[PDB]
């Protein structure tokens, strides 16, 4: 099945914390509606083409 509930039997303290956190951050990122992320990645992309300098005024 697609939804095959698999398990990952591991024993490492540092390993657990890193494996769980990176697993969680990615899973949550793809679960929650990436509204902020979409707009952020898209604007950062569009900024590259404007970085040549084309606006009358820009500020950060």
């Amino acid at each position: 099945s697609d939804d095959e509930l698999l398990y990952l039997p591991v024993r490492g303290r540092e390993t657990y914390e890193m494996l769980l956190e990176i697993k969680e951050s990615l899973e949550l990122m793809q679960y929650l509606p990436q509204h902020t992320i979409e707009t952020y990645r898209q604007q950062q992309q569009q900024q590259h083409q404007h970085l040549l300098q084309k606006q009358t005024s820009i500020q950060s």
Binding site: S25, L26, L28, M29, Y31, T36, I37, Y40
Partner: protein, 50 residues
């Protein structure tokens, strides 16, 4: 927000770059976006643990 320094990586890995980019961006976003859905799912799913 942070220091004035940046870490640079120069390596050629097709799989590695795809993987490291998604995991890299994932944590950067995880640090910038709050954790509501994280704790919400964590506990809702904790009900599956005993």
């Amino acid at each position: 927000g942070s220091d004035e320094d940046t870490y640079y990586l120069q390596v050629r890995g097709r799989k590695n770059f795809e993987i490291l980019m998604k995991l890299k961006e994932s944590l950067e976003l995880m640090e910038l976006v709050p954790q509501p859905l994280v704790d919400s799912y964590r506990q809702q799913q904790q009900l599956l643990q005993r």
